[PDB]
Design a protein around this nucleic acid. Structure first.
Ligand SMILES: [Mg+2]
Ligand SMILES: [Mg+2]
Ligand SMILES: [Mg+2]
Ligand SMILES: [Mg+2]
Ligand SMILES: [Mg+2]
Ligand SMILES: [Mg+2]
Ligand SMILES: [Mg+2]
Ligand SMILES: [Mg+2]
Ligand SMILES: [Mg+2]
Ligand SMILES: [Mg+2]
Ligand SMILES: [Mg+2]
Ligand SMILES: [Mg+2]
Ligand SMILES: [Mg+2]
Ligand SMILES: [Mg+2]
Ligand SMILES: [Mg+2]
Ligand SMILES: [Mg+2]
Ligand SMILES: [Zn+2]
Lengths: 307, 115, 110, 153, 224
RNA sequence: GAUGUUGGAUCAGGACACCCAAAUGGUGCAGCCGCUAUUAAAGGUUCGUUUGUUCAACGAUUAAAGUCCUACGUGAUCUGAG
């Protein structure tokens, strides 16, 4: 038995190719809109807010960057993060993860069934969601737990707050020493021969080995990084778009991990936020289409006059 | 960005500014820890074989949007007291300079046109 | 830099018999429904493309004969004919190439 | 680094690249199908597409005419571009070129080759990949599902 | 007779990058929210403008400036333009953000199109061309629906110039090159020309689908 | 039957007999500077004119512009003014 390679679309005919697609997308919209109502389904017990609590996070899409002006006249540049499809996936009890905090696994953007693994499609069939592209694990306290297969919207971070972002930084491949590290070069013109880039002496004569940490040319930039202490300026409710401050590591259009700030200055800031998470059903109110921080100049306004 | 060995042009009306010399006045030292000076920074000028202190007024390097960018690098002659050794400054000065009153007070007081 | 020691045949067997330097077994090979020769799944059949190619070459020769010189090329659409065929009205007003071989089964009339 | 770049570097430089494409495009507009290196066929694809989009702009447009001058070397071909090759594409927006991969060349070089062709040329039909017919056990098995989705609606 | 062509402010033209189109609808909705307060008039590189700024540090909060628009660049909310004027003999440039909330009133004194799409070369031109009267009154438009093309060759200071303007990549029709150059240098400049660029096809940027979509977006935004 | 030798360039590993930053004792310490002594090596320790020059003088500064070792570190990485 020499078994052949098979992809999903190999044996389908002209007739059946669109049918399969229409069918899969149909079942997808159905399964999505079905999970659209968490609170009336089989909601888990909601717990009050204690001071040592830690919230759930979000998975976003980096759109691009845009300028934004404060009422004070200063100009900030901000990054638009969008929440496309966000659902909590599985749940790990306290003892079963860190011995300390409970793991909540969150899914990202929707992909096609046809290219994933058997095991994974099994995992989503026992859930009822479409497969998510990027899946990250958040650490969370017992009072912040949610129920697996629950939707997470972008109103989750109320405007003004500090968040943290983790993502894979822009990959630059195999880079020389002057990029990767930032060693000065050798001078260009004075009779230097074939040296204008190279690291130069890499060690000491006695040691006769080169040390286990030594900086050398190599892989640069595809790695995880985290930006701390970013302020959130404004929120869009309809398109689910956060405007965070400064820059977020990754290429634009990349998938990005958002949490509340773990920085020591902000420790208790989570007392004012909708805590298990935000629930559009529960409040039964329409949030204004944009939530602005008190500082921001709104896209329409008096056109500032100092005095 | 005005740095060591930049030829600067002295805008205020002074003895040392207008009188000719075989050397254009050169900047020796900038007092920022960065070797680069900006508008409202402080310089040590070599003029006519002696050292005077100066205040950078405008320069040819671009700066934050809505800052005026000038055709030439312009300095005002200054002594240690912070007193301008000149009577008055004709060519226009960045309105941003009015931010710091403390150091530049007198310099601002003799300034004619702002932009 | 000059190698400090001859390497043993052991070390060499290790290096050049590595699973990476071995030729991988291609799993995408199939047979072509017409001539039953072998072809890779994403590539045209070699043997089929051959008879197609030969016929294209010959039809290009005869249409090289129908043209007088190097720079002279037809403004009409062309339609190629085989023994026993007469032009349809859809195809008339066009340049016609006449050929001896009766129309090959894989080339349709349309 | 290479990030976000839509052009290969082929031949002795940028100019050499344009002239390589020139030759290929002349060949393609003349013979209506050519077999060339896969990198270069795939490169030619875009230009072969948009050259037909100038043909549609009309014979009278000047910007199209000086364009046809640069890109079609053999001068006879230019009336072929406007009067022949442009008019037989009308309804079809982007559907001009078929590009398919041939077995690798038989010479010691062993490159990776492709044939590129205009739709509707009069040449023997290329032995295109066939789709599995509908009587196939699996496709026949999907028909049931379709008819049941029709029966439920 | 009603000649009708719609002038779309150049920063409603989205850049060539692969950015998700959702980003551009946002920027547009914001800058169109901004259009409704501060009125932004048409103008081109070569056109003379006067901007009023809110100035924190001055006593009269208004700061007035007047000059040529030398170049524009941007997209979405980050649109900018550059004004150039000679005050007292000092060359002065300012970079203004079009949609910036500090700007109060923009005013067009003279609407004009000069031959090149950017003039940075007015840096090396003689002081006349950069000088303008601070107090000049707005010289209005006759609604000819023809923005007047003023073809004016310029004189330049002796070399070197801040950029090399003689070279083909700049395509400068505005400079007077007979008086400022020699034949040798005009042959030199022709060694850097890249003739094949205009014929590059694929290098061409297609718009009109987007044009229709966003123009319809602006109609739809004015209606509501 | 060769361990290629000064000074720079690049990149520095280490000592502590601390030049800065950090806690302190004593003073012929009122405070401001200081002068001495104890404990502390994670991090710093500038740019120029003249000399091939390390050293040194001199200009201008810095919180400081340490003393050393590593084949007077480092030429199968570079430079040869000496
Ligand atoms: Mg990369
Ligand atoms: Mg260098
Ligand atoms: Mg070299
Ligand atoms: Mg040599
Ligand atoms: Mg002297
Ligand atoms: Mg690429
Ligand atoms: Mg090559
Ligand atoms: Mg491609
Ligand atoms: Mg320059
Ligand atoms: Mg020996
Ligand atoms: Mg060290
Ligand atoms: Mg000690
Ligand atoms: Mg140390
Ligand atoms: Mg040595
Ligand atoms: Mg040495
Ligand atoms: Mg060595
Ligand atoms: Zn075959």
């Amino acid at each position: 038995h020499g078994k052949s390679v098979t992809w999903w679309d190999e044996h389908l005919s002209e007739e059946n190719v669109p049918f399969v697609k229409q069918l899969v997308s149909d079942e997808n919209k159905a399964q999505l809109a079905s999970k659209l109502c968490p609170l009336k389904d089989e909601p888990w017990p909601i717990h009050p807010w204690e001071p040592g609590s830690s919230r759930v996070g979000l998975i976003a899409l980096k759109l691009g960057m845009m300028p934004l002006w404060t009422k004070d006249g200063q100009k900030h540049v901000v990054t638009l993060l969008q929440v496309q499809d966000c659902h909590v996936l599985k749940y790990t009890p306290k003892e079963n993860h860190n011995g300390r905090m409970a793991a909540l696994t969150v899914g990202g953007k929707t992909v096609s069934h046809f290219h994933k693994s058997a095991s994974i499609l099994e995992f989503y069939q026992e859930l009822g969601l479409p497969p998510k592209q990027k899946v990250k694990i958040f650490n969370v306290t017992e009072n912040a737990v949610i129920k697996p297969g629950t939707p997470l919207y972008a109103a989750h971070f109320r405007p003004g707050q500090y968040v943290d972002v983790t993502a894979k930084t822009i990959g630059k491949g195999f880079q020389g020493v002057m990029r990767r590290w930032g060693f000065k070069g050798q001078p260009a013109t004075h009779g230097q021969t074939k040296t204008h880039r190279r690291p130069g002496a890499i060690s000491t004569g006695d040691v006769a080995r080169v040390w286990p940490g030594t900086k050398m040319p190599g892989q640069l930039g595809n790695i995880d990084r985290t930006a701390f202490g970013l302020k959130v300026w404004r929120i869009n409710t309809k398109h689910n778009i956060i405007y965070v401050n400064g820059s977020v590591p990754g290429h634009k259009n990349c998938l990005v991990k958002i949490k509340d700030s773990k920085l020591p200055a902000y420790k208790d800031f989570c007392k004012n936020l909708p805590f298990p998470t935000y629930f559009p059903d529960g409040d039964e109110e329409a949030l204004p289409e944009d939530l602005y921080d008190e500082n921001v100049c709104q896209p329409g306004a008096p056109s500032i006059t100092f005095t | 960005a005005i740095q060591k060995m930049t030829r600067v042009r002295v805008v205020d009306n002074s003895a040392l500014g207008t009188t000719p010399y075989h050397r254009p006045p050169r900047c020796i030292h900038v007092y920022n820890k960065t070797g680069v000076g900006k508008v409202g920074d402080r310089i040590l000028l070599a003029i006519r074989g002696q050292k005077k202190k100066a205040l950078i007024v405008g320069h040819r390097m671009p700066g934050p949007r809505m800052t005026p960018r000038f055709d030439s690098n312009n300095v005002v002659l200054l002594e240690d007291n912070g007193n301008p050794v000149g009577t008055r400054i004709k060519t226009p000065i960045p309105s941003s300079l009015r931010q710091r009153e403390g150091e530049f007070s007198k310099v601002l007081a003799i300034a004619q046109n702002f932009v | 830099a000059a190698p400090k020691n001859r390497r043993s045949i052991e070390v060499n067997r290790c290096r050049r018999r590595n699973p990476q330097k071995l030729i991988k077994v291609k799993n995408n090979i199939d047979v072509c429904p017409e001539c039953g020769h072998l072809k890779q799944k994403h590539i045209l059949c070699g043997y089929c493309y051959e008879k197609v190619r030969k016929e294209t070459a010959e039809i290009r020769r005869q249409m090289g004969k129908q043209e007088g010189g190097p720079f002279r090329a037809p403004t009409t659409e062309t339609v190629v004919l085989y023994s026993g065929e007469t032009p349809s009205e859809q195809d008339q007003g066009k340049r016609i190439i006449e050929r001896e071989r009766k129309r090959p089964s894989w080339f349709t009339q349309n | 680094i290479s990030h976000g770049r839509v052009f290969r570097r082929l031949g002795l430089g940028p100019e050499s690249r344009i002239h390589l494409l020139q030759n290929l495009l002349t060949g393609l507009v003349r013979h209506e199908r050519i077999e060339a290196s896969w990198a270069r066929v795939d490169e030619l694809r875009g230009y072969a597409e948009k050259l037909i989009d100038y043909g549609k702009l009309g014979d009278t447009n000047e910007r199209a005419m000086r364009m046809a001058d640069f890109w079609l070397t053999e001068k006879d071909l230019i009336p072929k571009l406007f009067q022949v090759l442009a008019p037989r594409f009308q309804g079809q927006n982007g559907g001009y070129t078929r590009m398919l991969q041939i077995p690798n060349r038989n010479e010691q070089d062993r490159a990776k080759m492709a044939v590129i062709e205009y739709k509707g040329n009069c040449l023997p039909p290329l032995p295109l990949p066939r789709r599995d017919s509908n009587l196939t056990l699996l496709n026949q098995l999907l028909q049931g599902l379709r008819q049941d989705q029709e029966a439920s609606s | 007779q009603r000649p009708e062509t719609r002038f779309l402010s150049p920063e409603f033209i989205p850049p060539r990058g692969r950015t998700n189109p959702l980003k551009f609808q946002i920027e547009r909705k914001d800058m169109l929210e901004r259009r409704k307060i501060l009125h932004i008039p048409e103008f081109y590189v070569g056109s003379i403008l006067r901007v009023t700024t809110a100035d924190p540090y001055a006593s009269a909060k208004t700061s007035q400036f007047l000059g040529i628009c030398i170049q524009r660049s941007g997209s979405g909310l980050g649109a900018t333009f550059i004004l150039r004027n000679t005050i007292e003999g000092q060359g002065v440039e300012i970079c203004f953000e079009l949609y910036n909330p500090r700007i109060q009133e923009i005013q067009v004194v003279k609407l004009e199109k000069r031959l090149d799409n950017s003039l940075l070369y007015l840096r090396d031109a003689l002081p006349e061309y950069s000088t303008f009267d601070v107090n000049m009154k707005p010289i209005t438009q006759e609604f000819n629906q023809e923005v007047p093309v003023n073809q004016l060759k310029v004189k330049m200071k002796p070399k070197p110039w801040s950029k090399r303007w003689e070279r083909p990549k700049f395509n400068i029709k505005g400079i007077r090159f007979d008086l400022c150059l020699t034949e040798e240098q005009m042959r030199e400049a022709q060694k850097w020309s890249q003739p094949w660029l205009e014929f590059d096809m694929m290098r061409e940027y297609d718009t009109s689908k987007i044009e229709a979509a966003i123009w319809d977006e602006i109609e739809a935004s004015k209606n509501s």
